[PDB]
Design a protein around this motif. Structure first.
Motif, PDB file in Angstrom:
ATOM      1  N   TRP A 191      78.079  20.001  59.533  1.00  0.00           N
ATOM      2  CA  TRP A 191      77.917  20.970  58.519  1.00  0.00           C
ATOM      3  C   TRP A 191      78.171  22.298  58.699  1.00  0.00           C
ATOM      4  N   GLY A 214      76.881  13.543  57.544  1.00  0.00           N
ATOM      5  CA  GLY A 214      77.197  14.211  58.197  1.00  0.00           C
ATOM      6  C   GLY A 214      76.624  15.412  57.937  1.00  0.00           C
ATOM      7  N   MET A 262      77.573   5.040  58.310  1.00  0.00           N
ATOM      8  CA  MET A 262      76.576   4.185  58.111  1.00  0.00           C
ATOM      9  C   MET A 262      76.400   3.698  56.774  1.00  0.00           C
ATOM     10  N   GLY A 319      65.375  19.960  54.198  1.00  0.00           N
ATOM     11  CA  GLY A 319      65.570  21.569  52.953  1.00  0.00           C
ATOM     12  C   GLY A 319      67.106  21.191  52.089  1.00  0.00           C
ATOM     13  N   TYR A 347      74.662  19.912  61.105  1.00  0.00           N
ATOM     14  CA  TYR A 347      75.102  20.879  62.283  1.00  0.00           C
ATOM     15  C   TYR A 347      76.112  20.777  63.727  1.00  0.00           C
ATOM     16  N   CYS A 363      66.764  12.242  64.529  1.00  0.00           N
ATOM     17  CA  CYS A 363      66.797  13.634  64.593  1.00  0.00           C
ATOM     18  C   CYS A 363      65.123  14.342  63.997  1.00  0.00           C
ATOM     19  N   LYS A 423      70.849  21.238  64.698  1.00  0.00           N
ATOM     20  CA  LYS A 423      70.871  22.721  64.306  1.00  0.00           C
ATOM     21  C   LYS A 423      72.398  23.416  65.210  1.00  0.00           C
ATOM     22  N   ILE A 443      79.026   5.978  68.122  1.00  0.00           N
ATOM     23  CA  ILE A 443      78.101   6.925  67.717  1.00  0.00           C
ATOM     24  C   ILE A 443      78.097   6.662  66.319  1.00  0.00           C
ATOM     25  N   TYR A 460      67.105  23.485  68.362  1.00  0.00           N
ATOM     26  CA  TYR A 460      66.702  22.035  67.419  1.00  0.00           C
ATOM     27  C   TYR A 460      68.291  21.746  67.613  1.00  0.00           C
TER      28      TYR A 460
HETATM   29  C1  LIG Z   1      71.494  22.181  53.732  1.00  0.00           C
HETATM   30  C2  LIG Z   1      70.432  21.681  55.116  1.00  0.00           C
HETATM   31  C3  LIG Z   1      69.407  21.769  55.598  1.00  0.00           C
HETATM   32  C4  LIG Z   1      68.403  21.182  56.316  1.00  0.00           C
HETATM   33  N1  LIG Z   1      67.206  21.286  55.791  1.00  0.00           N
HETATM   34  C5  LIG Z   1      66.471  20.781  57.363  1.00  0.00           C
HETATM   35  C6  LIG Z   1      64.827  20.674  57.579  1.00  0.00           C
HETATM   36  O1  LIG Z   1      64.705  20.966  56.808  1.00  0.00           O
HETATM   37  N2  LIG Z   1      64.773  19.985  58.473  1.00  0.00           N
HETATM   38  C7  LIG Z   1      65.054  19.734  59.302  1.00  0.00           C
HETATM   39  O2  LIG Z   1      64.509  18.691  60.052  1.00  0.00           O
HETATM   40  N3  LIG Z   1      66.077  19.116  59.278  1.00  0.00           N
HETATM   41  C8  LIG Z   1      67.613  19.448  58.377  1.00  0.00           C
HETATM   42  N4  LIG Z   1      68.441  19.690  58.193  1.00  0.00           N
HETATM   43  C9  LIG Z   1      69.350  19.204  59.427  1.00  0.00           C
HETATM   44  C10 LIG Z   1      69.555  17.027  58.788  1.00  0.00           C
HETATM   45  O3  LIG Z   1      67.928  17.026  58.404  1.00  0.00           O
HETATM   46  C11 LIG Z   1      69.251  16.168  60.101  1.00  0.00           C
HETATM   47  O4  LIG Z   1      70.747  17.270  61.126  1.00  0.00           O
HETATM   48  C12 LIG Z   1      69.833  15.174  59.992  1.00  0.00           C
HETATM   49  O5  LIG Z   1      69.437  14.081  60.957  1.00  0.00           O
HETATM   50  C13 LIG Z   1      71.142  14.451  59.204  1.00  0.00           C
HETATM   51  O6  LIG Z   1      71.347  13.597  58.378  1.00  0.00           O
HETATM   52  P1  LIG Z   1      72.668  12.594  57.994  1.00  0.00           P
HETATM   53  O7  LIG Z   1      72.852  11.055  57.731  1.00  0.00           O
HETATM   54  O8  LIG Z   1      73.103  13.592  57.368  1.00  0.00           O
HETATM   55  O9  LIG Z   1      72.941  12.082  60.115  1.00  0.00           O
HETATM   56  P2  LIG Z   1      73.934  12.482  60.740  1.00  0.00           P
HETATM   57  O10 LIG Z   1      73.902  13.996  60.518  1.00  0.00           O
HETATM   58  O11 LIG Z   1      75.308  12.535  59.998  1.00  0.00           O
HETATM   59  O12 LIG Z   1      73.916  12.001  62.213  1.00  0.00           O
HETATM   60  C14 LIG Z   1      72.902  12.640  62.482  1.00  0.00           C
HETATM   61  C15 LIG Z   1      72.608  12.469  63.878  1.00  0.00           C
HETATM   62  O13 LIG Z   1      71.160  10.484  63.217  1.00  0.00           O
HETATM   63  C16 LIG Z   1      72.544   9.964  63.970  1.00  0.00           C
HETATM   64  N5  LIG Z   1      72.235   9.241  62.806  1.00  0.00           N
HETATM   65  C17 LIG Z   1      72.846   8.409  62.022  1.00  0.00           C
HETATM   66  N6  LIG Z   1      72.673   7.948  61.707  1.00  0.00           N
HETATM   67  C18 LIG Z   1      71.961   6.966  62.207  1.00  0.00           C
HETATM   68  C19 LIG Z   1      72.049   5.101  62.032  1.00  0.00           C
HETATM   69  N7  LIG Z   1      71.644   4.770  61.263  1.00  0.00           N
HETATM   70  N8  LIG Z   1      70.952   4.633  63.404  1.00  0.00           N
HETATM   71  C20 LIG Z   1      71.342   5.787  64.557  1.00  0.00           C
HETATM   72  N9  LIG Z   1      71.130   6.972  64.927  1.00  0.00           N
HETATM   73  C21 LIG Z   1      71.361   7.833  64.075  1.00  0.00           C
HETATM   74  C22 LIG Z   1      73.607  10.672  65.122  1.00  0.00           C
HETATM   75  O14 LIG Z   1      74.061   9.474  65.480  1.00  0.00           O
HETATM   76  C23 LIG Z   1      73.922  11.674  64.870  1.00  0.00           C
HETATM   77  O15 LIG Z   1      72.778  12.075  66.053  1.00  0.00           O
HETATM   78  C24 LIG Z   1      69.180  20.558  57.437  1.00  0.00           C
HETATM   79  C25 LIG Z   1      71.240  20.451  56.971  1.00  0.00           C
HETATM   80  C26 LIG Z   1      71.016  20.889  55.709  1.00  0.00           C
HETATM   81  C27 LIG Z   1      72.805  20.806  56.474  1.00  0.00           C
END
Ligand SMILES: Cc1cc2nc3c(=O)[nH]c(=O)nc-3n(C[C@H](O)[C@H](O)[C@H](O)COP(=O)(O)OP(=O)(O)OC[C@H]3O[C@@H](n4cnc5c(N)ncnc54)[C@H](O)[C@@H]3O)c2cc1C
Ligand SMILES: O=C(Nc1sccc1C(=O)Nc1ncccn1)c1nc2cnccc2s1
Length: 426
Positions: free
Chosen positions: A10, A51, A68, A111, A54, A123, A383, A46, A380
């Motif tokens: 991100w 996405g 996925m 968030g 960060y 995560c 982030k 992976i 974290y």
């Molecule tokens: C604006 C904003 C606000 C946010 N606020 C918070 C908050 O309040 N609290 C908090 O905890 N986080 C927060 N985050 C972080 C976000 O919640 C995590 O980064 C989350 O994991 C992202 O989900 P994603 O599907 O985009 O996963 P990605 O970012 O695409 O992947 C994250 C991780 O998950 C793994 N993963 C994804 N899909 C799978 C799967 N099917 N099987 C196995 N592993 C997988 C990936 O391999 C990678 O390690 C925030 C992010 C943003 C941009």
């Protein structure tokens, strides 16, 4: 079927090129992992969700990235058992909207709602309700995990396979691909919150408000705090606390559809200090999710253990006198941790800051890492994209135990990412 794509987190930083597989067919994913497993491990695979990390946890330079998000079927929702059975590519917004008419609430919302269930698990995400509900992994009842040998394992939090279940939670995709999961939801009769608001004048007051006992009366709590002003104003906050409303607490206008979800010359003087205090102090205000929850940069989030209050105050003081100005700052007190080795939250003072990329910032956040580490805290990984392996390892002392689980489930290092390599989690 795979396209060479430049991927970033991100934060739009540290890009690497991967072959990205994007397919709605789960059998093709099984075979892609089979193709990686036989290829002499290579630079491995992976999973990627939406996405929204960060960091670099969902990229794999010169290797395979599996998108996925096309696996986005909701298989079932049951209001009696409160269970939802979903593909790992379902997002929390889609899930939230599908679940509401059953009087079911997503147990942990972050968030943003644009995160996949697979990302929420990997995560081990937390939200405003951490101190009452824990993190996302606390509410997973089962998951189906595609491992290194191309077998799909059915994992539960208790019984045989518990160890791998708990390594997958907060595991950053490094135990395999979560294909499918069952989540226990929170029952609700409304899509609304009853919210109290408070405005503190100082860091001392903000801390005081979080340890005076009032936190036990609210299921949801967080704060915007000032990280730019000099003391005494440093660490003043706008605190937003509440709970899900019941039907009888709604006004009549809203009770028919309880579960429907659809800079001036005064600003920096005494008058606006008053204005901002008035507007941020309220009791029993009915708010929808959007109002209560969802209204060249470096994101930085850490937690300092509860008892290290004096140390927490010191880190905040270091931050404002650094010359690095963070305007958007979230503060929350975390409750009890779960049993996942790499889970981020621990009971304590959690803070998220955001710095504009500037001369001296990289070296200053390293110094911050050092302080966070010395004070028993951690960063974290959702982030972070710049901490060292040695820092991370000292911050997560159960890492060796986790690594041990990862070796049994992935002897040939089939599952790999830029983060795994940087943090030596491989
Ligand atoms: C604006 C904003 C606000 C946010 N606020 C918070 C908050 O309040 N609290 C908090 O905890 N986080 C927060 N985050 C972080 C976000 O919640 C995590 O980064 C989350 O994991 C992202 O989900 P994603 O599907 O985009 O996963 P990605 O970012 O695409 O992947 C994250 C991780 O998950 C793994 N993963 C994804 N899909 C799978 C799967 N099917 N099987 C196995 N592993 C997988 C990936 O391999 C990678 O390690 C925030 C992010 C943003 C941009
Ligand atoms: O971790 C985060 N928030 C946290 S941690 C513990 C609680 C909260 C939290 O409460 N988030 C939140 N609260 C009110 C309005 C909006 N968001 C966030 N990270 C980012 C990164 N970019 C934009 C927003 C956020 S919120």
């Amino acid at each position: 079927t795979t396209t060479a794509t430049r991927l970033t987190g991100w934060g739009r930083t540290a890009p690497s090129v991967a072959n990205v597989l994007r397919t709605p067919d789960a059998e093709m994913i099984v075979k892609a992992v089979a193709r990686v497993a036989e290829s002499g491990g290579g630079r491995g695979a992976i999973a990627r969700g939406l996405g929204r990390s960060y960091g670099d946890n969902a990229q794999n330079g010169g290797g395979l990235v599996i998108d996925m998000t096309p696996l986005n079927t909701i298989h079932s929702i049951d209001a009696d058992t409160k269970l939802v059975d979903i593909d790992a590519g379902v997002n929390l917004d889609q899930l939230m909207k599908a679940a509401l008419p059953f009087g079911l609430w997503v147990p942990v919302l972050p968030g943003t709602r644009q995160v996949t269930v697979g990302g929420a698990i990997a995560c081990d995400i937390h939200g405003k309700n951490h101190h009452s509900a824990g993190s996302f992994g606390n509410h997973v009842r089962s998951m189906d995990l595609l491992t290194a040998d191309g077998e799909i394992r059915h994992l539960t939090p208790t019984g045989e396979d518990a160890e791998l279940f708990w390594a997958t939670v907060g595991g950053n995709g490094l135990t395999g691909i979560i294909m499918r999961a069952t989540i226990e939801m929170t029952p609700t009769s409304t899509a609304y919150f009853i919210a109290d608001g408070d405005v503190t004048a100082s860091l001392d007051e903000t801390i005081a408000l979080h340890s005076d006992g009032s936190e036990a009366r609210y299921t949801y709590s967080s704060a915007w705090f000032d990280a730019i002003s000099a003391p005494p104003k440093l660490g003043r906050a706008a605190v937003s606390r509440g709970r899900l409303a019941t039907v009888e607490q709604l006004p009549a206008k809203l009770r028919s559809e309880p579960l429907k979800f659809d800079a001036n010359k005064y600003t920096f003087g005494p008058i606006g200090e008053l204005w901002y205090r008035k507007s941020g102090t309220y009791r029993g205000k009915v708010q929808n999710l959007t109002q209560f929850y969802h209204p060249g940069f470096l994101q930085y989030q850490f937690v300092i253990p509860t008892e290290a209050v004096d140390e927490f105050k010191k880190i905040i003081g270091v931050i404002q006198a650094s010359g690095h100005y963070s305007f958007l700052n979230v503060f929350k007190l975390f409750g009890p941790r779960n049993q996942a080795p790499l889970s981020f939250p621990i009971p304590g003072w959690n803070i998220c800051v955001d710095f504009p990329i500037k001369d001296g910032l990289g070296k200053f956040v390293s110094e911050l890492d050092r302080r966070v580490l010395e004070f028993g805290g951690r960063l974290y990984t959702a982030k972070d994209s710049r901490t060292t392996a040695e820092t991370f390892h000292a911050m997560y002392p159960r890492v060796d135990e986790w690594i041990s689980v990862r070796r049994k489930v992935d002897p040939l290092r089939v599952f790999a990412s830029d983060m795994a390599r940087r943090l030596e989690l491989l």
